[PDB]
PDB file of C-alpha atoms in Angstrom:
ATOM      1  CA  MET A   1      -8.825  -8.282  21.474  1.00 60.79           C
ATOM      2  CA  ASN A   2      -4.816  -7.572  21.423  1.00 60.52           C
ATOM      3  CA  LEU A   3      -2.055  -5.971  18.576  1.00 59.53           C
ATOM      4  CA  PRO A   4      -3.810  -8.215  15.745  1.00 62.42           C
ATOM      5  CA  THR A   5      -2.740 -10.926  14.647  1.00 60.10           C
ATOM      6  CA  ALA A   6      -2.106 -10.995  10.459  1.00 61.41           C
ATOM      7  CA  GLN A   7      -5.508 -12.644   9.970  1.00 60.80           C
ATOM      8  CA  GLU A   8      -7.536 -10.098  12.620  1.00 59.05           C
ATOM      9  CA  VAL A   9      -5.552  -7.274  10.517  1.00 56.73           C
ATOM     10  CA  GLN A  10      -7.357  -8.730   7.102  1.00 59.43           C
ATOM     11  CA  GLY A  11     -10.248  -9.014   9.081  1.00 60.13           C
ATOM     12  CA  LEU A  12     -10.448  -5.609  10.572  1.00 60.96           C
ATOM     13  CA  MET A  13      -9.281  -3.392   7.607  1.00 59.32           C
ATOM     14  CA  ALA A  14     -12.041  -5.436   5.062  1.00 61.01           C
ATOM     15  CA  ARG A  15     -14.637  -4.619   8.310  1.00 58.48           C
ATOM     16  CA  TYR A  16     -13.613  -0.912   7.458  1.00 56.81           C
ATOM     17  CA  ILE A  17     -14.239  -0.765   3.659  1.00 57.54           C
ATOM     18  CA  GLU A  18     -17.783  -2.347   4.540  1.00 56.79           C
ATOM     19  CA  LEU A  19     -17.815   0.124   6.860  1.00 54.92           C
ATOM     20  CA  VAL A  20     -16.982   2.967   3.832  1.00 57.24           C
ATOM     21  CA  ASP A  21     -19.331   1.288   1.654  1.00 54.29           C
ATOM     22  CA  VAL A  22     -22.724   1.290   4.043  1.00 55.54           C
ATOM     23  CA  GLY A  23     -22.016   5.130   4.877  1.00 54.92           C
ATOM     24  CA  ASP A  24     -21.294   3.986   8.358  1.00 52.10           C
ATOM     25  CA  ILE A  25     -19.313   7.911   9.893  1.00 50.29           C
ATOM     26  CA  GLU A  26     -19.608   6.713  13.618  1.00 49.91           C
ATOM     27  CA  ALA A  27     -19.283   3.110  13.597  1.00 46.33           C
ATOM     28  CA  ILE A  28     -15.654   4.469  10.830  1.00 43.51           C
ATOM     29  CA  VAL A  29     -14.872   6.579  14.159  1.00 43.53           C
ATOM     30  CA  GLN A  30     -15.373   3.844  16.722  1.00 46.10           C
ATOM     31  CA  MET A  31     -12.569   1.899  15.090  1.00 47.91           C
ATOM     32  CA  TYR A  32      -9.591   4.925  15.267  1.00 50.78           C
ATOM     33  CA  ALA A  33      -7.656   5.490  18.641  1.00 50.00           C
ATOM     34  CA  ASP A  34      -8.696   8.235  21.037  1.00 48.92           C
ATOM     35  CA  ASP A  35      -5.067   9.965  19.613  1.00 49.98           C
ATOM     36  CA  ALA A  36      -5.026   8.466  15.789  1.00 51.76           C
ATOM     37  CA  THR A  37      -3.763  10.498  12.513  1.00 50.71           C
ATOM     38  CA  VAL A  38      -4.670  10.395   9.430  1.00 49.62           C
ATOM     39  CA  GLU A  39      -2.828  11.309   5.967  1.00 51.64           C
ATOM     40  CA  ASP A  40      -5.843  11.151   3.019  1.00 51.00           C
ATOM     41  CA  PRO A  41      -4.260  11.723   0.319  1.00 52.10           C
ATOM     42  CA  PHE A  42      -0.245  10.364   1.695  1.00 53.10           C
ATOM     43  CA  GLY A  43       1.397  13.332   1.683  1.00 52.14           C
ATOM     44  CA  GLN A  44      -0.783  15.761   2.924  1.00 50.78           C
ATOM     45  CA  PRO A  45      -0.413  16.649   6.782  1.00 49.91           C
ATOM     46  CA  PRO A  46      -2.443  14.311   9.120  1.00 50.48           C
ATOM     47  CA  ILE A  47      -5.997  14.808  10.063  1.00 55.23           C
ATOM     48  CA  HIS A  48      -5.048  13.965  14.900  1.00 55.55           C
ATOM     49  CA  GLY A  49      -8.572  12.691  16.435  1.00 55.26           C
ATOM     50  CA  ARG A  50     -11.526  11.484  16.711  1.00 54.33           C
ATOM     51  CA  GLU A  51     -13.495  14.929  16.540  1.00 55.29           C
ATOM     52  CA  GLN A  52     -11.217  15.571  12.705  1.00 54.23           C
ATOM     53  CA  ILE A  53     -11.324  12.182  12.317  1.00 54.38           C
ATOM     54  CA  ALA A  54     -15.231  12.256  12.048  1.00 51.56           C
ATOM     55  CA  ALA A  55     -14.916  15.921  10.198  1.00 54.24           C
ATOM     56  CA  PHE A  56     -13.118  14.673   6.767  1.00 54.84           C
ATOM     57  CA  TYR A  57     -15.267  11.262   6.760  1.00 56.10           C
ATOM     58  CA  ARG A  58     -18.351  13.404   7.501  1.00 57.06           C
ATOM     59  CA  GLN A  59     -17.281  16.119   4.296  1.00 58.40           C
ATOM     60  CA  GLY A  60     -16.747  12.207   2.163  1.00 54.13           C
ATOM     61  CA  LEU A  61     -19.719  10.389   2.976  1.00 54.77           C
ATOM     62  CA  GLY A  62     -22.368  12.078   4.213  1.00 54.68           C
ATOM     63  CA  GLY A  63     -23.702  12.198   1.343  1.00 52.87           C
ATOM     64  CA  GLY A  64     -24.865   8.215   1.719  1.00 53.65           C
ATOM     65  CA  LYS A  65     -24.904   7.158  -1.485  1.00 52.87           C
ATOM     66  CA  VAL A  66     -20.614   6.747  -1.336  1.00 54.36           C
ATOM     67  CA  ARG A  67     -19.883   3.305  -2.817  1.00 55.13           C
ATOM     68  CA  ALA A  68     -16.609   1.426  -1.919  1.00 51.72           C
ATOM     69  CA  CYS A  69     -15.132  -1.825  -2.526  1.00 49.84           C
ATOM     70  CA  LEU A  70     -11.836  -4.545  -2.404  1.00 49.39           C
ATOM     71  CA  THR A  71     -10.495  -4.394  -5.639  1.00 51.77           C
ATOM     72  CA  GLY A  72      -7.814  -7.388  -4.563  1.00 48.78           C
ATOM     73  CA  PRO A  73      -7.019  -8.925  -0.752  1.00 49.96           C
ATOM     74  CA  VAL A  74      -5.271  -7.429   2.054  1.00 50.56           C
ATOM     75  CA  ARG A  75      -2.055  -7.401   2.686  1.00 52.08           C
ATOM     76  CA  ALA A  76      -1.474  -7.720   6.589  1.00 52.25           C
ATOM     77  CA  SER A  77       1.553  -8.082   8.354  1.00 49.18           C
ATOM     78  CA  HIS A  78       2.398  -9.879  11.679  1.00 48.45           C
ATOM     79  CA  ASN A  79       3.181  -6.196  13.759  1.00 45.63           C
ATOM     80  CA  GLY A  80      -0.567  -4.977  13.217  1.00 44.14           C
ATOM     81  CA  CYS A  81       0.165  -3.238  10.320  1.00 41.38           C
ATOM     82  CA  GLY A  82      -1.637  -3.922   5.970  1.00 41.66           C
ATOM     83  CA  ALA A  83      -2.190  -2.697   2.922  1.00 42.30           C
ATOM     84  CA  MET A  84      -5.182  -3.030   0.773  1.00 42.19           C
ATOM     85  CA  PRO A  85      -5.852  -2.159  -2.936  1.00 42.19           C
ATOM     86  CA  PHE A  86     -10.037  -0.474  -2.991  1.00 40.91           C
ATOM     87  CA  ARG A  87     -11.946   1.655  -5.631  1.00 40.57           C
ATOM     88  CA  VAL A  88     -14.520   4.575  -3.677  1.00 40.02           C
ATOM     89  CA  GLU A  89     -17.768   5.257  -6.395  1.00 37.07           C
ATOM     90  CA  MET A  90     -18.985   8.871  -5.381  1.00 37.92           C
ATOM     91  CA  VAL A  91     -21.372  11.509  -7.874  1.00 38.02           C
ATOM     92  CA  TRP A  92     -18.923  14.557  -8.084  1.00 40.93           C
ATOM     93  CA  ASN A  93     -21.391  16.892  -9.747  1.00 42.90           C
ATOM     94  CA  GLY A  94     -24.887  14.503 -11.161  1.00 43.47           C
ATOM     95  CA  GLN A  95     -21.056  12.296 -12.903  1.00 44.18           C
ATOM     96  CA  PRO A  96     -20.961   9.439 -11.583  1.00 45.88           C
ATOM     97  CA  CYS A  97     -16.824   9.481 -10.430  1.00 43.97           C
ATOM     98  CA  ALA A  98     -14.347   6.476  -9.038  1.00 44.01           C
ATOM     99  CA  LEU A  99     -11.176   6.486  -7.187  1.00 45.19           C
ATOM    100  CA  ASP A 100      -8.873   4.236  -6.768  1.00 48.66           C
ATOM    101  CA  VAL A 101      -6.753   3.987  -3.440  1.00 48.54           C
ATOM    102  CA  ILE A 102      -4.878   1.806  -1.237  1.00 47.64           C
ATOM    103  CA  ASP A 103      -4.903   2.737   2.319  1.00 48.13           C
ATOM    104  CA  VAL A 104      -1.912   1.415   4.546  1.00 45.58           C
ATOM    105  CA  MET A 105      -2.442   0.806   8.686  1.00 44.73           C
ATOM    106  CA  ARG A 106      -1.366   0.533  11.557  1.00 44.54           C
ATOM    107  CA  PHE A 107      -2.861  -0.825  14.424  1.00 43.96           C
ATOM    108  CA  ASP A 108      -2.905  -0.712  17.952  1.00 47.86           C
ATOM    109  CA  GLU A 109      -2.350  -3.103  21.158  1.00 47.88           C
ATOM    110  CA  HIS A 110      -5.933  -2.669  21.074  1.00 50.28           C
ATOM    111  CA  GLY A 111      -7.103  -3.288  18.144  1.00 49.13           C
ATOM    112  CA  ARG A 112      -8.042   0.142  16.945  1.00 48.99           C
ATOM    113  CA  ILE A 113      -6.396   1.894  13.498  1.00 49.81           C
ATOM    114  CA  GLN A 114      -3.993   4.437  15.444  1.00 52.00           C
ATOM    115  CA  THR A 115      -2.236   5.488  11.986  1.00 53.49           C
ATOM    116  CA  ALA A 116      -4.472   5.299   8.071  1.00 54.66           C
ATOM    117  CA  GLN A 117      -2.751   6.680   5.050  1.00 53.00           C
ATOM    118  CA  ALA A 118      -4.103   6.913   1.983  1.00 52.60           C
ATOM    119  CA  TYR A 119      -2.468   6.764  -1.254  1.00 50.79           C
ATOM    120  CA  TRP A 120      -3.957   8.417  -4.543  1.00 52.59           C
ATOM    121  CA  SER A 121      -3.674  11.364  -7.015  1.00 53.31           C
ATOM    122  CA  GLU A 122      -6.608  13.148  -9.125  1.00 51.31           C
ATOM    123  CA  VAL A 123      -5.198  10.470 -12.175  1.00 49.92           C
ATOM    124  CA  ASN A 124      -6.777   8.160  -9.794  1.00 49.29           C
ATOM    125  CA  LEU A 125      -9.081   9.877 -10.435  1.00 48.94           C
ATOM    126  CA  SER A 126     -12.182   8.676 -13.392  1.00 53.71           C
ATOM    127  CA  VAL A 127     -15.019  10.556 -14.166  1.00 51.05           C
ATOM    128  CA  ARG A 128     -16.296   8.634 -17.131  1.00 51.05           C
TER     129      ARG A 128
ATOM    130  CA  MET B   1      15.175  12.948 -12.976  1.00 53.75           C
ATOM    131  CA  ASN B   2      14.775  15.936  -9.270  1.00 54.49           C
ATOM    132  CA  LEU B   3      11.924  14.057  -6.616  1.00 51.64           C
ATOM    133  CA  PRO B   4       9.775  12.479  -8.908  1.00 53.62           C
ATOM    134  CA  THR B   5       6.165  14.617 -10.182  1.00 56.17           C
ATOM    135  CA  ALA B   6       2.776  11.188  -9.825  1.00 56.62           C
ATOM    136  CA  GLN B   7       3.433  10.510 -12.924  1.00 56.31           C
ATOM    137  CA  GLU B   8       6.420   9.724 -12.630  1.00 54.21           C
ATOM    138  CA  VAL B   9       6.367   8.020  -9.474  1.00 55.77           C
ATOM    139  CA  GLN B  10       3.556   5.825 -11.678  1.00 53.69           C
ATOM    140  CA  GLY B  11       6.406   4.866 -14.075  1.00 52.78           C
ATOM    141  CA  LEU B  12       9.173   4.123 -11.703  1.00 52.88           C
ATOM    142  CA  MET B  13       6.934   1.965 -10.173  1.00 52.35           C
ATOM    143  CA  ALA B  14       5.322  -0.023 -13.445  1.00 53.67           C
ATOM    144  CA  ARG B  15       9.589   0.057 -14.240  1.00 53.50           C
ATOM    145  CA  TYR B  16      10.903  -1.689 -10.940  1.00 54.63           C
ATOM    146  CA  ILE B  17       7.105  -4.251 -10.924  1.00 53.50           C
ATOM    147  CA  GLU B  18       9.080  -5.362 -15.931  1.00 52.38           C
ATOM    148  CA  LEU B  19      11.992  -5.433 -14.314  1.00 50.88           C
ATOM    149  CA  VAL B  20      11.677  -7.892 -11.650  1.00 53.93           C
ATOM    150  CA  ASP B  21       9.358  -9.658 -14.165  1.00 51.86           C
ATOM    151  CA  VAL B  22      11.748  -9.948 -16.530  1.00 50.05           C
ATOM    152  CA  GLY B  23      14.389 -10.354 -13.883  1.00 48.56           C
ATOM    153  CA  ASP B  24      17.449  -8.120 -14.103  1.00 47.74           C
ATOM    154  CA  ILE B  25      18.636  -8.204 -10.820  1.00 47.95           C
ATOM    155  CA  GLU B  26      22.173  -5.440 -11.641  1.00 47.85           C
ATOM    156  CA  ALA B  27      19.188  -3.108 -13.597  1.00 47.51           C
ATOM    157  CA  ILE B  28      16.735  -2.981 -10.087  1.00 45.98           C
ATOM    158  CA  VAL B  29      19.798  -2.401  -7.151  1.00 47.07           C
ATOM    159  CA  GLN B  30      20.325   0.771 -10.658  1.00 46.42           C
ATOM    160  CA  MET B  31      16.923   1.602  -9.554  1.00 49.39           C
ATOM    161  CA  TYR B  32      17.493   2.385  -5.745  1.00 48.30           C
ATOM    162  CA  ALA B  33      19.245   4.912  -4.348  1.00 49.04           C
ATOM    163  CA  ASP B  34      22.997   3.558  -2.114  1.00 48.16           C
ATOM    164  CA  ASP B  35      21.526   3.557   0.572  1.00 48.74           C
ATOM    165  CA  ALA B  36      18.469   3.150   0.570  1.00 50.17           C
ATOM    166  CA  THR B  37      16.692   0.286   3.288  1.00 53.79           C
ATOM    167  CA  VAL B  38      14.228  -3.109   1.802  1.00 56.68           C
ATOM    168  CA  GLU B  39      11.924  -3.852   4.526  1.00 54.10           C
ATOM    169  CA  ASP B  40      10.313  -7.411   2.304  1.00 53.68           C
ATOM    170  CA  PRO B  41       7.695  -8.680   4.579  1.00 53.16           C
ATOM    171  CA  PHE B  42       7.160  -4.910   6.202  1.00 52.99           C
ATOM    172  CA  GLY B  43       7.768  -5.998   9.891  1.00 50.97           C
ATOM    173  CA  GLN B  44      11.218  -7.906   8.616  1.00 51.19           C
ATOM    174  CA  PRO B  45      14.539  -5.025   9.993  1.00 47.50           C
ATOM    175  CA  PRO B  46      14.923  -3.825   6.980  1.00 48.78           C
ATOM    176  CA  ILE B  47      18.024  -4.685   5.224  1.00 47.78           C
ATOM    177  CA  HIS B  48      20.259  -1.409   3.819  1.00 51.89           C
ATOM    178  CA  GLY B  49      22.354  -0.211   1.580  1.00 53.16           C
ATOM    179  CA  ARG B  50      22.853  -2.038  -2.075  1.00 50.87           C
ATOM    180  CA  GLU B  51      24.980  -5.027  -2.031  1.00 50.89           C
ATOM    181  CA  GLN B  52      22.681  -5.981   0.641  1.00 52.25           C
ATOM    182  CA  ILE B  53      19.492  -4.974  -1.614  1.00 50.95           C
ATOM    183  CA  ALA B  54      21.438  -7.019  -5.126  1.00 51.26           C
ATOM    184  CA  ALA B  55      21.983  -9.937  -1.995  1.00 53.33           C
ATOM    185  CA  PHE B  56      18.085 -10.435  -0.856  1.00 57.51           C
ATOM    186  CA  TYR B  57      17.276  -9.572  -4.970  1.00 58.87           C
ATOM    187  CA  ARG B  58      20.040 -12.909  -6.511  1.00 60.57           C
ATOM    188  CA  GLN B  59      18.458 -14.444  -3.577  1.00 61.26           C
ATOM    189  CA  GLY B  60      14.177 -14.273  -4.399  1.00 59.03           C
ATOM    190  CA  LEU B  61      14.654 -13.250  -8.786  1.00 61.67           C
ATOM    191  CA  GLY B  62      18.317 -15.804  -9.202  1.00 57.21           C
ATOM    192  CA  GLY B  63      16.140 -18.953 -10.593  1.00 56.89           C
ATOM    193  CA  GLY B  64      14.912 -16.953 -13.069  1.00 60.66           C
ATOM    194  CA  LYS B  65      11.966 -18.084 -13.421  1.00 54.66           C
ATOM    195  CA  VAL B  66       9.237 -15.883 -11.261  1.00 57.83           C
ATOM    196  CA  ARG B  67       6.802 -13.000 -12.786  1.00 57.50           C
ATOM    197  CA  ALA B  68       5.510 -10.578 -11.843  1.00 56.99           C
ATOM    198  CA  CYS B  69       2.869  -8.084 -13.378  1.00 56.73           C
ATOM    199  CA  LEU B  70       0.496  -5.562 -11.442  1.00 59.41           C
ATOM    200  CA  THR B  71      -2.577  -6.212 -10.370  1.00 59.50           C
ATOM    201  CA  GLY B  72      -4.271  -3.061  -9.971  1.00 57.04           C
ATOM    202  CA  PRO B  73      -3.171   0.771 -11.010  1.00 56.15           C
ATOM    203  CA  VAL B  74      -0.066   3.146  -9.384  1.00 58.57           C
ATOM    204  CA  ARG B  75      -1.440   5.009  -6.227  1.00 61.39           C
ATOM    205  CA  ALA B  76       1.280   7.993  -6.565  1.00 61.34           C
ATOM    206  CA  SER B  77       1.798  11.199  -3.957  1.00 60.03           C
ATOM    207  CA  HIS B  78       2.700  14.061  -4.951  1.00 61.15           C
ATOM    208  CA  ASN B  79       5.999  13.612  -2.477  1.00 58.69           C
ATOM    209  CA  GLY B  80       7.018  11.333  -3.998  1.00 62.15           C
ATOM    210  CA  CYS B  81       5.689   7.747  -2.811  1.00 62.24           C
ATOM    211  CA  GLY B  82       3.595   5.730  -4.653  1.00 65.35           C
ATOM    212  CA  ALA B  83       1.954   2.068  -4.095  1.00 64.10           C
ATOM    213  CA  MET B  84       1.110  -0.865  -5.715  1.00 62.16           C
ATOM    214  CA  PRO B  85      -0.365  -3.958  -5.624  1.00 64.85           C
ATOM    215  CA  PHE B  86       1.097  -6.467  -7.416  1.00 64.84           C
ATOM    216  CA  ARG B  87       1.636 -10.628  -8.206  1.00 64.96           C
ATOM    217  CA  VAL B  88       4.918 -12.533  -7.664  1.00 62.71           C
ATOM    218  CA  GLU B  89       4.480 -16.310  -9.847  1.00 65.15           C
ATOM    219  CA  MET B  90       7.009 -17.639  -8.054  1.00 61.91           C
ATOM    220  CA  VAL B  91       8.168 -22.274  -7.783  1.00 62.36           C
ATOM    221  CA  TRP B  92       8.963 -23.489  -4.868  1.00 63.26           C
ATOM    222  CA  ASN B  93       9.252 -26.556  -4.943  1.00 63.70           C
ATOM    223  CA  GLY B  94       8.674 -27.794  -8.632  1.00 63.67           C
ATOM    224  CA  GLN B  95       5.935 -26.723  -7.895  1.00 61.37           C
ATOM    225  CA  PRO B  96       3.471 -22.878  -8.408  1.00 61.00           C
ATOM    226  CA  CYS B  97       2.955 -20.150  -6.186  1.00 61.92           C
ATOM    227  CA  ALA B  98       1.436 -17.231  -6.310  1.00 63.36           C
ATOM    228  CA  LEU B  99       2.172 -14.651  -3.517  1.00 59.71           C
ATOM    229  CA  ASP B 100      -0.296 -10.515  -3.688  1.00 57.75           C
ATOM    230  CA  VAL B 101       2.077  -8.297  -2.535  1.00 54.56           C
ATOM    231  CA  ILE B 102       1.206  -4.247  -2.210  1.00 57.10           C
ATOM    232  CA  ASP B 103       5.197  -2.574  -1.898  1.00 57.46           C
ATOM    233  CA  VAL B 104       5.285   1.104  -0.749  1.00 54.96           C
ATOM    234  CA  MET B 105       8.374   3.473  -1.635  1.00 55.38           C
ATOM    235  CA  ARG B 106       9.520   6.316  -1.349  1.00 54.60           C
ATOM    236  CA  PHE B 107      11.523   8.834  -3.689  1.00 54.28           C
ATOM    237  CA  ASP B 108      14.322  10.890  -3.241  1.00 52.22           C
ATOM    238  CA  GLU B 109      14.930  13.645  -5.077  1.00 50.38           C
ATOM    239  CA  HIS B 110      17.055  11.749  -8.307  1.00 47.47           C
ATOM    240  CA  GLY B 111      14.388   9.556  -8.774  1.00 49.30           C
ATOM    241  CA  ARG B 112      15.596   6.664  -7.238  1.00 50.27           C
ATOM    242  CA  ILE B 113      14.080   4.415  -4.276  1.00 51.22           C
ATOM    243  CA  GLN B 114      14.794   6.043  -1.062  1.00 50.89           C
ATOM    244  CA  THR B 115      12.929   2.936   0.830  1.00 50.28           C
ATOM    245  CA  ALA B 116      10.709   0.074  -0.078  1.00 55.38           C
ATOM    246  CA  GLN B 117       8.035  -1.733   1.898  1.00 55.20           C
ATOM    247  CA  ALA B 118       6.576  -4.919   0.928  1.00 56.34           C
ATOM    248  CA  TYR B 119       3.309  -5.670   2.887  1.00 58.18           C
ATOM    249  CA  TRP B 120       2.677  -9.561   2.892  1.00 59.70           C
ATOM    250  CA  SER B 121       2.161 -12.706   5.419  1.00 58.32           C
ATOM    251  CA  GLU B 122       2.191 -16.084   4.635  1.00 58.36           C
ATOM    252  CA  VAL B 123      -1.611 -16.463   3.997  1.00 57.16           C
ATOM    253  CA  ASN B 124      -0.963 -14.216   0.472  1.00 56.09           C
ATOM    254  CA  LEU B 125       1.191 -17.454  -0.558  1.00 58.72           C
ATOM    255  CA  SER B 126      -0.873 -19.974  -2.929  1.00 56.52           C
ATOM    256  CA  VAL B 127       0.529 -22.715  -4.115  1.00 53.96           C
ATOM    257  CA  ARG B 128      -2.656 -24.655  -5.275  1.00 56.03           C
TER     258      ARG B 128
END
């Protein structure tokens, strides 16, 4: 793939959510370029590179029971970027929780994620 | 106000949508700092400053019948930023249209919008 088209960004972002939802860590890491950054939550310092990104996703998804689903359409650009709204379900002390998130991503000229920025704060959490 | 808190970002972003929805242009322009930028759609060159921003909103809302509403919660940060999903209804040739959008905004230390980035592409449009 080259720089993704708006159509392709929709596909890729949607794919990312599918991989979070099944909790496939190596497949998630494979979406990222070599030396990609992740800011999650946006406002924290970026993590760098596929090893740090893998560790991050292990700390998040290595329970195996997280679920994630789009809660509206991917909004894509013509310059290989997009933003999407989703909800993550997690169990955080035998208590179900939900977190509402918006990811902004920028893709490189090979279709890998170059930057990911996950917008959310503690009030987007619902312990329920 | 100072740099907005996550709570305050929610309020401000929500307010912005309310002002779009009633089509109040001077109130929208007053939310922006002096020398704020707007990228709408993200991928296009930024417009600069309160006069260009006013002209932009006039070209968008000076029919008076556009409507806008959040389609999920504002996701806020602890560094005066947030992102929100919304839908804009417009009539574009006597034909109702809807556009799905995600705005990312960064606020300054006075609570004014410093940058606004509106993520959307033509496939987020529905002529219906």
